[PDB]
Design an enzyme around this catalytic site. Structure first.
Site, mmCIF file in Angstrom:
data_model
loop_
_atom_site.group_PDB
_atom_site.id
_atom_site.type_symbol
_atom_site.label_atom_id
_atom_site.label_comp_id
_atom_site.label_asym_id
_atom_site.label_seq_id
_atom_site.Cartn_x
_atom_site.Cartn_y
_atom_site.Cartn_z
ATOM 1 N N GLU A 1 33.208 45.910 -39.417
ATOM 2 C CA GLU A 1 33.196 47.139 -40.211
ATOM 3 C C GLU A 1 33.886 46.931 -41.548
ATOM 4 O OE1 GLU A 1 31.756 49.975 -39.859
ATOM 5 O OE2 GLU A 1 31.024 49.807 -37.797
ATOM 6 N N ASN B 1 27.850 56.541 -48.549
ATOM 7 C CA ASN B 1 26.607 56.769 -47.827
ATOM 8 C C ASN B 1 25.683 57.727 -48.577
ATOM 9 O OD1 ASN B 1 27.332 55.262 -45.395
ATOM 10 N ND2 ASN B 1 28.937 56.846 -45.236
ATOM 11 N N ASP C 1 24.266 60.511 -47.648
ATOM 12 C CA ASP C 1 24.516 61.939 -47.465
ATOM 13 C C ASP C 1 25.737 62.463 -48.215
ATOM 14 O OD1 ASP C 1 26.576 60.849 -45.972
ATOM 15 O OD2 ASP C 1 26.120 62.005 -44.145
ATOM 16 N N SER D 1 28.775 61.275 -47.931
ATOM 17 C CA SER D 1 30.006 60.950 -47.204
ATOM 18 C C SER D 1 30.443 59.540 -47.569
ATOM 19 C CB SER D 1 29.760 61.093 -45.709
ATOM 20 O OG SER D 1 28.894 60.058 -45.234
ATOM 21 N N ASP E 1 32.822 56.174 -45.806
ATOM 22 C CA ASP E 1 33.520 55.553 -44.684
ATOM 23 C C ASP E 1 34.839 54.925 -45.164
ATOM 24 O OD1 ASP E 1 31.265 56.134 -43.094
ATOM 25 O OD2 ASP E 1 30.305 54.303 -43.861
ATOM 26 N N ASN F 1 34.196 58.086 -40.975
ATOM 27 C CA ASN F 1 33.308 58.817 -41.879
ATOM 28 C C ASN F 1 33.804 60.217 -42.209
ATOM 29 O OD1 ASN F 1 30.701 60.746 -41.978
ATOM 30 N ND2 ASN F 1 30.403 58.757 -43.019
#
Ligand SMILES: [Cl-]
Length: 129
Positions: A35, A46, A48, A50, A52, A59
């Site tokens: 990750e 991301n 949308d 958002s 991370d 998220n």
């Protein structure tokens, strides 16, 4: 901070992740490797809106509040900035909520694709715990 493999394993063990909700420690170390490459400051945007955050790429749509994500639910009740600390406590405490929500470690895409189905105990081999 960039953790070493065994350093992170020991830190995660001290914070109660070994076997938590059925997931042995090597799962969590493997997830953090793929990750974030063990980096507490990793961030990824991301489509949308958002982001991370941190060593476990938590998220902002569901779990932390970053003030810039539409529809946020903040289920860990923490600012996302706390997840970029070099101390992993806030990330681990939120991860425990995520894995108990329902679908286990499937919340972490890199775990699902690159760790699940392998011998994840190899990730803690050679470490003094
Ligand atoms: Cl924030």
């Amino acid at each position: 901070k960039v953790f070493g493999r065994c350093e992170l394993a020991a830190a995660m063990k001290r914070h109660g992740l070994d076997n938590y909700r059925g997931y042995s420690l090597g799962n969590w170390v493997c997830a953090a490797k793929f990750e974030s490459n063990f980096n507490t400051q990793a961030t990824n945007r991301n489509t949308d809106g958002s982001t991370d955050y941190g060593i476990l790429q938590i998220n902002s749509r569901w779990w932390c509040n970053d003030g810039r994500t539409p529809g946020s639910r903040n289920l860990c009740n923490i600012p996302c900035s706390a997840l970029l600390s070099s101390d992993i406590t806030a990330s681990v405490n939120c991860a425990k909520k995520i894995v108990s929500d329902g679908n286990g470690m499937n919340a972490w895409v890199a775990w699902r694709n690159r760790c699940k189905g392998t011998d994840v105990q190899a990730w803690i081999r050679g470490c003094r715990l």
